[PDB]
Amino acid sequence: ARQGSFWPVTFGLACCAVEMMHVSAPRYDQDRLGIIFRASPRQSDIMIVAGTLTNKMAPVLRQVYDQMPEPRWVISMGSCANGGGYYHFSYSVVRGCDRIVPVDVYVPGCPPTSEALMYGVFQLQRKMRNTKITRMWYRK
Amino acid sequence: MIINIVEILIFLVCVLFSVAYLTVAERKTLAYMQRRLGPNFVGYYGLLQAFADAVKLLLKEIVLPKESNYIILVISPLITLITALIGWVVIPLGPGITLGELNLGILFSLAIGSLGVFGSLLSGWSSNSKYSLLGSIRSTAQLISYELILTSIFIIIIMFVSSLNITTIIETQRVVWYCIPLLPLLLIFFIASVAETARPPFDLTESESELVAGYFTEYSGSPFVFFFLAEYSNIILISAFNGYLLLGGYLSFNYSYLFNILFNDYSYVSFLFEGLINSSAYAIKLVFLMFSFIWVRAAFPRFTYDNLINFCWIILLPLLFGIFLIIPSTLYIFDSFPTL
Amino acid sequence: RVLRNAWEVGPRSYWKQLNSIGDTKSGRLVGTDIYGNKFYETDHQDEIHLRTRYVEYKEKDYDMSQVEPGWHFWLGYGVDTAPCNTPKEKLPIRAYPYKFQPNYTGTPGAFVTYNTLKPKISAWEPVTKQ
Amino acid sequence: RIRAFTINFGPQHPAAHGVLRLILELSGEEIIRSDPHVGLLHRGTEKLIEYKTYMQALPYFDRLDYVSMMTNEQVFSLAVEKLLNVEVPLRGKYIRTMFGEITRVLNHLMSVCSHAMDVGALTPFLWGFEEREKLMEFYERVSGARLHAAYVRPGGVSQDLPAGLLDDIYMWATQFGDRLDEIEELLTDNRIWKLRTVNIGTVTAQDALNLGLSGPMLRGSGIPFDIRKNAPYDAYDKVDFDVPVGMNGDCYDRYLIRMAEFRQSLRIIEQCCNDMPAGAVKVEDFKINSPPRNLMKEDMEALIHHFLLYTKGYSVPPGETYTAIEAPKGEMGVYVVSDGSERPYKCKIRAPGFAHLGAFDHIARGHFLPDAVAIIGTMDLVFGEVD
Amino acid sequence: APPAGFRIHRPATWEESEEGALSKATKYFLLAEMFRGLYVVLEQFFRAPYTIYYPFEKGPVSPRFRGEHALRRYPSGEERCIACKLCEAICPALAITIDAEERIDGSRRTTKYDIDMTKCIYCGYCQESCPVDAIVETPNVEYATETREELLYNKEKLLANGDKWELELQYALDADAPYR
Amino acid sequence: YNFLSVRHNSRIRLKTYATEVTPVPSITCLYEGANWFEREAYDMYGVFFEGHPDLRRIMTDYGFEGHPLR
Amino acid sequence: QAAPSWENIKDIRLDPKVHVDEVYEPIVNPADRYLQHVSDL
Amino acid sequence: IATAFAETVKFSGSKQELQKRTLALYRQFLRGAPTFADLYEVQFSIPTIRTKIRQEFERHRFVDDLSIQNVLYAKGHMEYQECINFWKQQAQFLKYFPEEDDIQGRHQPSNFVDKF
Amino acid sequence: RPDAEKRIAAVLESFDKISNPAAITPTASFAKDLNLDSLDTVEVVVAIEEEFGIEIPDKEADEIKSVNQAVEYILAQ
Amino acid sequence: VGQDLPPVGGYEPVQWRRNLPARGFRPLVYLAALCGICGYGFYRALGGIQERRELKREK
Ligand SMILES: CCCCCCCCCCCCCCCCCC(=O)OC[C@H](COP(=O)(O)OCCN)OC(=O)CCCCCCCCCCCCCCCCC
Numbered sequence A: 001a002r003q004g005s006f007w008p009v010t011f012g013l014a015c016c017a018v019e020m021m022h023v024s025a026p027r028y029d030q031d032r033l034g035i036i037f038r039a040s041p042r043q044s045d046i047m048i049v050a051g052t053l054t055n056k057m058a059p060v061l062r063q064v065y066d067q068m069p070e071p072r073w074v075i076s077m078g079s080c081a082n083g084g085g086y087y088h089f090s091y092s093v094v095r096g097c098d099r100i101v102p103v104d105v106y107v108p109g110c111p112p113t114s115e116a117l118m119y120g121v122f123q124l125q126r127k128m129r130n131t132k133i134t135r136m137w138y139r140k
Numbered sequence B: 001m002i003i004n005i006v007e008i009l010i011f012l013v014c015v016l017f018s019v020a021y022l023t024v025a026e027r028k029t030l031a032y033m034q035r036r037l038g039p040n041f042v043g044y045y046g047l048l049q050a051f052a053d054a055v056k057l058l059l060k061e062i063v064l065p066k067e068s069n070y071i072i073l074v075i076s077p078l079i080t081l082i083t084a085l086i087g088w089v090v091i092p093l094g095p096g097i098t099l100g101e102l103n104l105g106i107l108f109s110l111a112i113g114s115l116g117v118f119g120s121l122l123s124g125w126s127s128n129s130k131y132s133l134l135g136s137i138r139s140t141a142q143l144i145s146y147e148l149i150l151t152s153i154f155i156i157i158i159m160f161v162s163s164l165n166i167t168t169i170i171e172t173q174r175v176v177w178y179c180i181p182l183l184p185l186l187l188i189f190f191i192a193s194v195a196e197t198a199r200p201p202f203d204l205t206e207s208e209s210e211l212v213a214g215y216f217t218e219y220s221g222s223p224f225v226f227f228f229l230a231e232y233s234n235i236i237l238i239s240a241f242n243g244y245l246l247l248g249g250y251l252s253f254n255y256s257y258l259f260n261i262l263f264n265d266y267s268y269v270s271f272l273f274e275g276l277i278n279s280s281a282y283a284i285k286l287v288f289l290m291f292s293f294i295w296v297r298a299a300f301p302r303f304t305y306d307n308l309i310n311f312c313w314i315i316l317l318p319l320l321f322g323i324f325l326i327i328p329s330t331l332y333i334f335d336s337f338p339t340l
Numbered sequence C: 001r002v003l004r005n006a007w008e009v010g011p012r013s014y015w016k017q018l019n020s021i022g023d024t025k026s027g028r029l030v031g032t033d034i035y036g037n038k039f040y041e042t043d044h045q046d047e048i049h050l051r052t053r054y055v056e057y058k059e060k061d062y063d064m065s066q067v068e069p070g071w072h073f074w075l076g077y078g079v080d081t082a083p084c085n086t087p088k089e090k091l092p093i094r095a096y097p098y099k100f101q102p103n104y105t106g107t108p109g110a111f112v113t114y115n116t117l118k119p120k121i122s123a124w125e126p127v128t129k130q
Numbered sequence D: 001r002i003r004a005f006t007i008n009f010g011p012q013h014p015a016a017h018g019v020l021r022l023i024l025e026l027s028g029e030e031i032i033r034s035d036p037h038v039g040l041l042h043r044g045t046e047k048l049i050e051y052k053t054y055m056q057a058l059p060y061f062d063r064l065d066y067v068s069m070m071t072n073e074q075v076f077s078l079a080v081e082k083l084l085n086v087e088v089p090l091r092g093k094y095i096r097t098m099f100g101e102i103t104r105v106l107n108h109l110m111s112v113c114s115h116a117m118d119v120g121a122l123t124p125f126l127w128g129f130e131e132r133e134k135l136m137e138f139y140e141r142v143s144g145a146r147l148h149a150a151y152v153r154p155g156g157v158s159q160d161l162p163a164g165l166l167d168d169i170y171m172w173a174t175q176f177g178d179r180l181d182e183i184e185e186l187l188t189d190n191r192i193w194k195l196r197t198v199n200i201g202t203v204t205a206q207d208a209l210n211l212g213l214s215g216p217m218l219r220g221s222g223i224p225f226d227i228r229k230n231a232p233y234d235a236y237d238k239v240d241f242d243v244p245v246g247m248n249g250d251c252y253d254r255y256l257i258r259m260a261e262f263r264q265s266l267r268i269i270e271q272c273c274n275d276m277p278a279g280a281v282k283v284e285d286f287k288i289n290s291p292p293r294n295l296m297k298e299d300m301e302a303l304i305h306h307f308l309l310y311t312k313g314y315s316v317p318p319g320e321t322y323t324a325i326e327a328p329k330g331e332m333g334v335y336v337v338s339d340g341s342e343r344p345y346k347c348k349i350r351a352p353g354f355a356h357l358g359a360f361d362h363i364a365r366g367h368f369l370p371d372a373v374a375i376i377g378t379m380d381l382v383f384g385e386v387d
Numbered sequence E: 001a002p003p004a005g006f007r008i009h010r011p012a013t014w015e016e017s018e019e020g021a022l023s024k025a026t027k028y029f030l031l032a033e034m035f036r037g038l039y040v041v042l043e044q045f046f047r048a049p050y051t052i053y054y055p056f057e058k059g060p061v062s063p064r065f066r067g068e069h070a071l072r073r074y075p076s077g078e079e080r081c082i083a084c085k086l087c088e089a090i091c092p093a094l095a096i097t098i099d100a101e102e103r104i105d106g107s108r109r110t111t112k113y114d115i116d117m118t119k120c121i122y123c124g125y126c127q128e129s130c131p132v133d134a135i136v137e138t139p140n141v142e143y144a145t146e147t148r149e150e151l152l153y154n155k156e157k158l159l160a161n162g163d164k165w166e167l168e169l170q171y172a173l174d175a176d177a178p179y180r
Numbered sequence F: 001y002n003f004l005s006v007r008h009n010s011r012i013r014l015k016t017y018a019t020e021v022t023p024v025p026s027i028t029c030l031y032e033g034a035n036w037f038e039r040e041a042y043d044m045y046g047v048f049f050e051g052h053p054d055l056r057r058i059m060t061d062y063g064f065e066g067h068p069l070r
Numbered sequence G: 001q002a003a004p005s006w007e008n009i010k011d012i013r014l015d016p017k018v019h020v021d022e023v024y025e026p027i028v029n030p031a032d033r034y035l036q037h038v039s040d041l
Numbered sequence H: 001i002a003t004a005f006a007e008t009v010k011f012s013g014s015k016q017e018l019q020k021r022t023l024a025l026y027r028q029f030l031r032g033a034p035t036f037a038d039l040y041e042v043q044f045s046i047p048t049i050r051t052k053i054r055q056e057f058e059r060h061r062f063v064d065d066l067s068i069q070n071v072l073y074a075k076g077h078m079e080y081q082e083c084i085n086f087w088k089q090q091a092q093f094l095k096y097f098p099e100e101d102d103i104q105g106r107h108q109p110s111n112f113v114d115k116f
Numbered sequence I: 001r002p003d004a005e006k007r008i009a010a011v012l013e014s015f016d017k018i019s020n021p022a023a024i025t026p027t028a029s030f031a032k033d034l035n036l037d038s039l040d041t042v043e044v045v046v047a048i049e050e051e052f053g054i055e056i057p058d059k060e061a062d063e064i065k066s067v068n069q070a071v072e073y074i075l076a077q
Numbered sequence J: 001v002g003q004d005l006p007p008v009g010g011y012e013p014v015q016w017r018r019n020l021p022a023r024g025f026r027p028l029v030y031l032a033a034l035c036g037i038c039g040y041g042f043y044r045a046l047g048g049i050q051e052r053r054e055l056k057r058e059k
């Protein structure tokens, strides 16, 4: 059930958001999988950070991250979003969102393909298929 | 006593399972209308997405320090109880002759469709945010202004009826296919029907991130599935309500079933079949109606609050008062009034 | 008419196919199966652009990167010709093993990394004379 | 007296493709005072390419304005090759012109789609992205990725086209006019977009010239002036190109002028499919851009040029220049002060998305908030072209 | 003073009357212009979709598309990279870190070879400048590691990645190297 | 300053010189397209200006001192 | 017109599409377009 | 064509007038301190804000040139402008406040011996 | 007026840097009598206006040099 | 210079303009037939009501 619906909230900062909305394009559709994102951080599950991440943004990003329910994950979409990427040597850029939010699936490269974002999504769902939360209540 | 509780369980599981798969249905038909494919992956075929999404979004449940939980933990349950479900108390042509309702139909549906509006308003009352409650007052104001011209038109179509119990409209309408063939203000009822249950081309208080990254409150968790299910269930109820009075139940092949059932069955074999085709008639008159809702979701964009109140209190309502300056007039002219 | 154009599969593979892909493509020319997986090109006359070539993955735990990547063009349309045709293009390989680990992410045996060399400075060894 | 409050408009997703932090004040849900607030995305390219070489500069440079990529590549390359006193051969000018116009199709398409999604209609958005995916492939069969590209160089371009691309792009442009009509039939005519867009955000020409506006809003305010017909860079001289002119400075003519620029750019793709010459597609010499990779492995001089062109960049003569072309969001200017060395001593971009955003407060007054959502999308506020 | 800029011809365009003769009230009164758009989207509803079942199908992969930096070797390959540092000096995010040494057999090889896949923009300049064509953008999108520590590609990852496929790279070069 | 004609299709450039110490006056008195750009000039440089409303920061962090394009 | 794209009427063309010659890009001038304009300016 | 809290840029000539102008700036910058503590929800008290504001202006008591004091006045009034509303956020706002010691552990006692 | 300056000589006494409250004559100077800084002068002015919950204009802050002036402006409400 | 992707030795030019209203009955008949349908509808509707005149007194 958690692996099926799986909607994000767009944070969507730059070019990598143009590829994100290309996943909403009809070629590599989100809704053939279930990805129907709301624009609201409480109604969300995972928080795709796409685009580069400024120094100026990062407190707003962590404040969005905190008002988000407990089964939460983060996708770092785009090379700039993880390890700073193509700028990384600015005064005003954050050297990767690992300095801000904990991330569970990275997505490489300036703009990663719509193929790439969906492959990261399926790898995240493959991680979800090993969450084993109920038998971890049983303390396996 | 046992037969009626299993009756009511069959009808509740019909409406609940119905409104469950309706969201998958509309998303599919938007998707083909948007030249793509809808939920095509979930489990066993791809008919199952909402039925997994309900189990998904239960297990979130946040609360907000800006607001008492005691109102928002109940106000989406309010419109889930009253707006969604006990509108079906009228059994809005539970599509046979019979219902699960005694009598005095249409104004009960009026009262409960009226009762949903401050379920929306007190929902938007929450969180004490000076940018939020004005949007709430906006939503509720346009909501009541189109409630009024649902009300003042389905009280004038029953001027061809005059009987207030539920069935008598339906047995009256089988002679003419009275519903739309004598009057096409169905369409303005239809354009009223997108507003009083806002699943609209209006989307007006769903200024999703125009406010501080939240539209209604973002009461996610069980109140989210409550609001979601009640909005869709209000849609299929008011769509049935359109197919109740101003669109017709009891399709004319059952009128021709005099030339069919007399050629099919001998004498009353447990009434085995006619309720089924009657249900088939009402169901195909209902889903074909809401297919136009799913059109108008993805055909025309949002509708600009000041122009929306322009669209209520300036144009449609004086046309309306003309139209029941003539429907009392024209039947008085041509021959005469209806009895009850 | 897509129903009887799925009847060409045979329902034993169809009830698995529908359990794998949401659509049921017509079972067509297999191309050639690979190290893990089975492919299909499609000679169907009426299908949309770039939904011709596809894959049955032979594993319920399915993903990408199970494709041996010589075929990855032929699933991404990098070549008209199926890669089991020309031998003179296909053979640089004398780097002799071809073990082909698909991807190990999230698996305990994930790839990690390390400096190759040694430290740059080479601290002295504690040898004392008298 | 006035006692007005304020809101913050968009933290993350108010207008798509924009971190639109707009500190907006209201009295009666009227925008008496407007204070756009951009700059959340100050990635600092303007600093960073002071330590990069010119070959290194370009994949910084289309990261600005990330919906019109190789047009931004082209304006930087024109600024540099103007400062080199060289001229790219005719094959290069025609393929950069046709790529500028499919890029123009892409930019106006994504602008109208995101505009209409903010307005509320979802189908034009997805229908337009359906052939934006075909244009993504037409980048992809040329570039190394889907939308970003190092394909333009200062010395012309990277590499000549493949054959099936030029054969296919005709068959694409055969249907694109039909589908452009198809998305046009349900917005241009309806009463929604006729009160959803009225004389709204009227900007007079006396004011629009004083605001530093350009491009589509300028020509919507009824001054028949762009750069392309008036300062013809890169073979727009040689192609029949007709420019639409507004009559009323509202957002409706700013809609219809883009919708005319589509079916003007398709003529350009037509005649650039026809007039495509054969020739060198890089620059003719090899002192300045790149050697050909065939004879870089059979020759001394080709190796030394290859080596120095990827180590030290290359020589640029000193001095200043400024070069503006009409990107599909408006006049993009590039102002480059070159040291006389391997690396640019100063580069200042100039963005219509930084000027139109500056004009936003003077335009937005006397409206409502759902007016303001549309008037963002009209003036092409994709905030990756702020800094 | 000719100064030829003139002639916008300024159409006065009164347009008071004779647009319609009560047909105007019909088209305004009921939504004929808008029912037209509904008929358009219904006619669009019947036609073909465009979804590509991405685990099972794939979008078009041009031969010049960029990927994950696999190091080629020769036929019977002696690790074709020579640490020539040209692929260092143009990596525009400085995502290249090389160190080299004279190896035992006399030639020069890479002591370490480092790609910050955190910060590889995929400009392909590495591929456009390594003269022995030894670093190559792949077409494979085979990624999505859970740590940065699973992204920082050393020499062994890249040699392994080239050893995983050169078939695809041979297809790529043999459709591209007469254009590069 | 780069300026653009409309009647004449002709650009021009106009330069001053200013020190971090002493300001030079703005040009927002003449037209309204200035007051955004001169904020950008002040933020990137600390070239301080004069006769101007709302000389804020846009292009940096709000607690960030220094001036980057120095 | 008609005969454009899919649901095909079986009519297409990818043949005889050439102009085969040797180039004649006779030019040398770096910046001579501007000299009259520079003299005006 | 607007402001936000009436930021004006016009440097006067005489050092007495600049003195008075910085004085009135100090009054507003001091008066807004409970508005600051309301707005950002700090841990420390309003007198901590006041003694640190006094510290910040005593950092530039002995600056000679009025033509340096001009842009110091602009920086002061401008950061007052960006503090009087919610442009700055509390993560941005704590860059003035080296509040806690226990983040550092044992550290340099400013002796030469404990540089080693 | 009566015992307004009781509150003022309570606030200024509660304010630091004035080690001698016996040196605080009420009708006396600020910077001459107690060596108050010109910065600290308007600091204690803002302390005074914050104690009485009252807001002052700019020239009223300009003219205050002794507390008899301050009490005379306190008298305005 | 060798075989690069030159143009075609023809054009076959394509669409660059607008499109049209659908069927031939643009005028008010698209309204006037509406007055036909009500002109049928009441023609039975009141008549059914007229028949209930005989029906009610029957009971
Ligand atoms: C005569 C003999 C018979 C006698 C009985 C008469 C019964 C006739 C039946 C009822 C008559 C229908 C009346 C329809 C009312 C609609 C009027 C209307 O919409 O006015 C347009 C108005 C435009 O706005 P505004 O700018 O203020 O206009 C001034 C311009 N100078 O307002 C607007 O802004 C337009 C907003 C409309 C939003 C509609 C959204 C789409 C609705 C389409 C879905 C319906 C299709 C499905 C049903 C059709 C079934 C066939």
Ligand code: SF4
Pocket (backbone or CB within 6 Å): A014, A015, A016, A050, A051, A052, A077, A078, A079, A080, A081, A085, A086, A109, A110, A111, A112, D063, E121
């Ligand atoms: S990761 Fe790449 S695509 Fe994304 S913002 Fe950075 S440079 Fe742009």
Ligand code: SF4
Pocket (backbone or CB within 6 Å): E090, E091, E092, E093, E094, E095, E096, E115, E119, E120, E121, E122, E123, E124, E125, E126, E127
């Ligand atoms: S592809 Fe580009 S970013 Fe990556 S290493 Fe090569 S030159 Fe650098």
Ligand code: SF4
Pocket (backbone or CB within 6 Å): E080, E081, E082, E083, E084, E085, E086, E087, E088, E098, E126, E129, E130, E131, E132, E133, E134, E135
């Ligand atoms: S460009 Fe070639 S020789 Fe130079 S470091 Fe890269 S692989 Fe080695």
